[PDB]
Write a protein that binds this DNA or RNA. Sequence first.
RNA 1: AUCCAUGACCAAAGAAUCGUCACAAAUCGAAGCUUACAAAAUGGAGUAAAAUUUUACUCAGUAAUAUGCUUUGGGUUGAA
RNA 2: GGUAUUCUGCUUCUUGACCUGGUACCUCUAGGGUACUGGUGUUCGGUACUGGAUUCCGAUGGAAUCU
Lengths: 126, 169, 780, 243
Amino acid sequence: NTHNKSTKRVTKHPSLKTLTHKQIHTTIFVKSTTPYVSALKRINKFLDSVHKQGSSYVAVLGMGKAVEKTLALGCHFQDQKNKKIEVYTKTIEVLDEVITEDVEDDDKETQLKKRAVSGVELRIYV
Amino acid sequence: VRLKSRYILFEIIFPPTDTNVEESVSKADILLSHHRASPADVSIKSILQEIRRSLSLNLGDYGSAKCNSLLQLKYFSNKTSTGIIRCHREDCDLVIMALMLMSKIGDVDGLIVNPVKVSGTIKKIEQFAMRRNSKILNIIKCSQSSHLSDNDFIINDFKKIGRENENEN
Amino acid sequence: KQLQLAMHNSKAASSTRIFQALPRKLRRRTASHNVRRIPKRMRNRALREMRKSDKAHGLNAKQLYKARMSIKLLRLASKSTSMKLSMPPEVTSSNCHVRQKIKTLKRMIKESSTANPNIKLLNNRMGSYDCTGVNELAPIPKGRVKYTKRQKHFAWLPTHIWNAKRSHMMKRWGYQMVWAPTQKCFKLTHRLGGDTCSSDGALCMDSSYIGTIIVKDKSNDSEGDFLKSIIGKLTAERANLRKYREGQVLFQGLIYSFNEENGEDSTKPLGPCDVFWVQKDTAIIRLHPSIYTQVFNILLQHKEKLTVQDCRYSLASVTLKGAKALESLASCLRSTEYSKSFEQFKMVSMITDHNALPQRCTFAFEAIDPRHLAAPKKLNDSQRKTVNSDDILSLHENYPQDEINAVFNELCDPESRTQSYNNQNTLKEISARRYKLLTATPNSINKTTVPFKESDDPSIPLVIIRRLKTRDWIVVLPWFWLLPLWHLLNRIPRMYHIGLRQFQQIQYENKQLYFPDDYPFTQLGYIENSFYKKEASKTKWDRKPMGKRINFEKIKDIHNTKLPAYSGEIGDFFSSDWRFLQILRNGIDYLQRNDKTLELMDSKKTGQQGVRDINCVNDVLEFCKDYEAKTKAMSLSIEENIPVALCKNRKCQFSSSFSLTFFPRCIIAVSCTLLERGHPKDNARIYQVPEKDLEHWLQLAKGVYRPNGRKDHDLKIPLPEVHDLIGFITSGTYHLNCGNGMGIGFIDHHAAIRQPTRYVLIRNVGTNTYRLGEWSKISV
Amino acid sequence: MLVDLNVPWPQNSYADKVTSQAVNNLIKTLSTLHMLGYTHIAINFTVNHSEKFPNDVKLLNPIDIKRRFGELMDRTGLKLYSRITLIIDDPSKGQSLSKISQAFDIVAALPISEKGLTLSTTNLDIDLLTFQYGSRLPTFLKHKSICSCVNRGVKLEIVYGYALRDVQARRQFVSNVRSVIRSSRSRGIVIGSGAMSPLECRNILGVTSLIKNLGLPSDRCSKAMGDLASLVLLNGRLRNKSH
RNA sequence: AUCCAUGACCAAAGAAUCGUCACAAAUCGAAGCUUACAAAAUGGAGUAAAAUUUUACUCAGUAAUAUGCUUUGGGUUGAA
RNA sequence: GGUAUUCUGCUUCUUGACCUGGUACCUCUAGGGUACUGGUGUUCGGUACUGGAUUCCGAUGGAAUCU
């Protein structure tokens, strides 16, 4: 065992993903610092140009800070807009860098670790 | 150079203005009551004739000739009273003045002529009209179960006014 | 011509289908319909040459050129159709068969000067060889005679004849490089090469102009340990460490110029550098052309102990940016044998978000002639779509060290990459080889790519590396092989080539500097700032009629109280003037030697041993005015008033040596974002926020609303003094990644370490409007 | 938002009570104004400043805003306010406005004769001034009378209602509006609407043109129903701190 | 050998900054604010009470702030 | 020793017009291709790729379907 006394710098990495040019044009990654009306307009403008990609739903998608924010947007489309939505809860794994632990600079040795969080995918139909 | 233009989108509201009615209060009912269709006695000629009458009386010869040079009525529907008119860019305000200071079209009485937007190109007022109809349909289908408005004064009309008379490129 | 067949064809479709017009990036306009026209100078020479009638029997001094060019004239005017000389000149009406075949070609040229030695023809039917200078510089590669005449001063890249048709060129630093393409690409560059997630393409740049120096020890012992000292002196003690040598990860930093050979010595920053270590006694260095020679000769001070190859004319490189970058490159590369480093390359070409990959992702192998494929083709990758984060951890343990080293060492040896050309095929024989595939033995395949021979075809060494700071992919290749590859790479339906301005924009968006324009602490950045931009701006300013341009010294209400020194704006009108900053800040500091309370002006004390007293701040401003246009506009002097931030601590300082231009004033580099309206252009000024009115600006930051409900903007804007100037902005425009204007610049170091807050005021040049902003540091 | 602040309340004096048909008409016209786009609305009330004001501190504002219209402040978001239009004719007859200040939010004035008009701009507690555009304003009014009040916190009001009823009133309205515009140098002008029926209301994007083609600059036509009309309401509500 | 005035010809260039304009969408038009996270998922850190269980709380500060904010529109290195 | 001007040498190199008659040669199937050598007897060439989705085969390859 070992306590995580890793107050030294940690460079969090984005979660590994893979796309197919069909999930490019029918998916939104809600960031933590996304203004509400920004994502509202984005979603409102994908539900108008998704038929030509041969699809029937838009996959809003977020974790951490995003989740409640994400859910709020879902609410705004459930009622007061009259659309049907599906909710899925997912688990996600990401990678974090940690140093191996004169005076040297930031350029130190690197070791990878795996840490898991949870998020939500939310499919809004047309 | 090339001559500019402005397009005006005008609706007709038929308020009830009659006593002993005591209507209900809700965003659905007010719109569903004020937006009844036109009695079909009005036509494409009656509106133009009345808007010419209202100019040579509230304005003079030099006010009724700077607008009558180019004033054409393009599209008008009876199921929903929306219509589109065209005029010069520098002489659009006088047409608006004709619009407000005019009521009692022909013989029909008790009504309001309402210009809702003015724009330069013709491609954009079509998109505006589509968005307006979508907004009305959304607000009428959200107060409750939609089919409580089963009288179908306007519900079957917005979908069916798609491009039937709007192919004026 | 019967429509029945048209109906039968459309039966493979709907009844009446509708097709769109072409996208506007795939349209062309019709040229003229008549044949091309020849220049008159090529007409007169040919006409006078054909009209002409026909002591070791050679006697050909300077007449050899006349004969060897008359032959070409005769061939041209006997072959081309556009040649419309007159009625009489014909192939047979004048002796063209007899001439230059039995009169000139053999009787005259062959019988005067015997063919010179070195009749070693080549191992190729296309001119392709190596141009490397061991311990010396190298000349331009030989090629077409016509186009090698124009490279006397500015060289060419391998793709120049291709780019010239599709770009705007310039001429700098001895190269004719590419600046920007001929279409607007501000937003497309952002959303295909930026850090967005909407990328469905890639950007490729031909960066062959960056040199390459292959330094290696010669003690014959693999331990080296003297090249280590050279690399540790050349830069700061960074690029010789366990992370960079043993793990052989790429390095990006700053490179100096040491001169320690007699007593007193120092160092001065030069610019960026790319150092890659191999087998602990070989190093590869990549440098911007401008600083190529100055460092190089430094290494030549110890060529007794090392060896250097100016291989900048033998190795080419290409840089790739975007998300779907490796996917497109992998669609035009196959191997000769089975190698694990191609298995990893096949697997990792399916990520689409390259920020997840670890620090090191080096690939290196041997490809075949890419002209075999005749069309880019996928890697059948759709079968496997369950890549997870557990196989990525395998890439840090299953590293093919020996298989990388063996294929790598076929680039640091001139004869190896000379053998790499051993038999390069012409286009027609590849065409015939492909045609021979219509009568193959399997008879149930219908293949298109030609096969590969075991020993009668060349193998191209190839290296791919990943740059983390710039976040892109380098591909390093032999020089003459670049053109065949680059032809395929631009047939991808969504691949775009970018110039040099797009590179500047991309590196601006990611909050990073740019060596030519944005290094005012380097000997060449200072020149580019105060000597090259200023002329280009003033030349177009003072060459306008007065009144049709912004008047600079007639501007009202710039500062709270006006000093009579400068009537209008402060400093030069055309550049970020750092000399004035140094003088003004030093004078302001000296004015508080022991009298804490400064003072602006005393009303007419007097006019002036050449006394220049230091009483009032107007005196400092007039001292700065005097020092310019009368001390350096008629004479020369060089000094670097701008150092960079140092880890040590040398902040403070203090009638013997009190000059205002003797000590460098340290600064730092920041990025400032605007909380409200604004659009900072270049060279704008950065003021500290006064202690008075701090509450008003804080309230404006929080938000002040009209009774209507919107934001309140039209208020009384207070103004600061002129001694509140602490920085300049060197690059700024609308930042699309955040939706608000943003700028990057430099600010005085001692100013920031005494602010009670984190706000600054920004105003352009030639304007008096002060916008608010907040700044964050950049770790460079 | 849009602010229209001259909807009349059907009562002539402190004696009569409100019938049923009057309030029934008022509700319909309020609904129509809500449809056309207006969100904030005020309700007018006319007295003569020379009558026996109720002595008790209640029943001096018979609007009864919180029981009536309770089903319109929800089910639709429009908000309602209260105001009174005093008519000033004599320079006397007491009843200083310190009493009715707490019972309303907006206090106006409608001078009739020269003495009343010069008293109104001299020293009162009004926060808005209005005229009878119907017919026969006391003419030749100059910058001298209006400058002092408009320099302080007072605003002028136009109604445009009389342009819709009859031609004879329309001519007088268009004659007097030009005088009132040019006398104040286009400063502190706001627009209300006298809607005696659910027919005499109008939209926004035309009435702004109706004022722009009479003399008002186009920069001020966009702030009548807007920032100024919002500021008067904000101050009127913030006056409620008397308690 | 100098100057001034009128006329002819050649050549350069075709001003900058600030503020306002109703809608859970707008404007006479266009665009931007999508590489999903606070290391609170090695199965987070602590306080109180009652016979491990049950019942009450503290810890996330550039914190977050809802049809909201920001940029731009006729010859851009004169003739479109 | 210099620079502006003037006259005389040298170095820069991929066996390349079209049509056509001969000899020798060739791993090409009585005909084709290549070397050495003779005859004055206005637009035309080769090679090459559609975007997207789904499916099948003991594969850095091949195959089929829809839009």
